[PDB]
């Protein structure tokens, strides 16, 4: 798994620091093991349509 | 002249040291840090 450039979220989602919203709150999250397993499940469902 | 280049590793190190100095662990454990302070909110996007 590869991650996007952090500056994309730096210049768009946290462009104003005086306010907070759903995306700004969620950018501070770090996944656990079961959530990474869920990501693998999502990709497996994507590669086998239907 | 204070010089900072575009390299990501040095900027990450500078960000980590600044976070340590502005938000030390001992103040976090004792619940002594105010997250709504302007100089704390500014640290999100300083040297990205």
């Amino acid at each position: 798994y590869i991650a996007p450039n952090p500056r994309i979220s730096s210049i768009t989602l946290t462009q104003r620091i005086t306010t907070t919203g759903p995306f700004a709150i969620l950018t501070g999250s770090t996944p656990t093991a079961q959530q990474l397993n869920d990501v693998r499940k999502i990709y497996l469902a994507l590669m086998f349509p239907g | 002249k204070i010089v900072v280049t575009d390299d990501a590793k040095k900027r990450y190190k500078i960000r980590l040291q600044r976070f340590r100095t502005h938000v030390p662990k001992i103040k976090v454990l004792k619940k002594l840090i105010d997250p709504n302070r302007m100089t704390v909110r500014n640290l999100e996007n300083q040297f990205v």
Binding site: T20, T27, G28 | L16, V23, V28, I33, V40, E44
Partner: peptide, 15 residues
């Protein structure tokens, strides 16, 4: 460890 986010800091200390 990893560099913290200012949004996660208030979540942690609010507890």
């Amino acid at each position: 460890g990893p560099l913290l986010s200012v949004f996660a800091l208030q979540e942690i200390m609010q507890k």
